Design a protein around this ligand. Structure first.
Ligand code: NI
Ligand code: NI
Ligand code: NI
Lengths: 129, 129, 129
């Protein structure tokens, strides 16, 4: 059965404006170099980092709505415990660590991401047999 | 198995333009006060009501494409029979009444919504064991 | 279980700019007449063809991420082998031919599409019992 579903839409300009601020949730996710690059909204880096961000958000939303979430407020370091990386063809891959990793060992996480010029989006489906 | 899938994209400005017109499908959904608020496209109310609207649409699309739909034209008062509300953390919740409620008693409806500044979106998955 | 998931976002203006170029992937999909129409970004044709395009892309992404894909690079004529058509109510329908048709005989493909004025989107879920 499906465990949780998440969708996220990212304004690429709003992302560029927020991405390169110290100690943001982005800083736990992306390197300082990546965030500097992505601060230019016209850049390839902004488009692809914003889609990576949408994917992570979508995954967190699916988690939030699921039975693995107890309190309504996200736990500590959910943002370090969930990573979404892309292969050299831009296909996303979910990587778990910490408590999330242990808790979600027996569930599958499906994720897809996309972007146009102004907007990025992703969908996540958490699923179990 | 999955019963039906739906996605919906809402222009927040186009929504603001349409939301506050008498006897629209919106009027069956949202209060006059909510619709007045949402008629300003720059408002928090427009952004969040448009995402609520996208969610409801996504759910109706999933229903339309499913075996629970006979005629291609939507039934009477589908719009009163399906409600999507948000908690104080903005997490959506589906509420059914009328015929839809009776018909869909044994199926789960997963829904997720999101918005940026100009656009809102939602996904719905209807699913059964 | 879910076999593969895909989401796609299409800039309707960028689509109009690309859709009517000879020997593009679009040319394998849509007729010359359809592509001429869709080259005007303000047109109904651009909006609906771009949503049809998003759907096909979403389906291909779901396929790419699935076990039915061996090499990371898409196979020959994936674009002729997968078709997404719309009924007169604008509900999408997947049509398979060639190798894809044979390979995916026992899996279901769920698809949904949508558009606003500037943007189109679709989601695809490939699923098996
Ligand atoms: Ni890109
Ligand atoms: Ni909001
Ligand atoms: Ni249309």
């Amino acid at each position: 059965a499906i465990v949780g579903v998440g969708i996220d839409l990212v304004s690429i300009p709003d992302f560029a404006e927020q991405v390169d601020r110290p100690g943001t949730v982005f800083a736990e996710t992306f390197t300082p170099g990546e965030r500097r690059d992505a601060a230019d909204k016209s850049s390839s880096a902004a488009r692809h980092l914003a889609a990576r961000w949408a994917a992570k958000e979508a995954v967190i939303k699916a988690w939030s709505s699921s039975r693995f979430s107890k309190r309504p407020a996200l736990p500590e370091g959910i943002h370090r415990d969930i990573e979404v990386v892309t292969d050299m063809w831009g296909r996303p891959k979910v990587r778990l660590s910490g408590e999330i990793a242990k808790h979600l060992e027996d569930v599958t996480i499906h994720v897809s991401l996309t972007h146009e010029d102004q907007t990025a989006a992703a969908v996540a489906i958490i699923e179990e047999p």
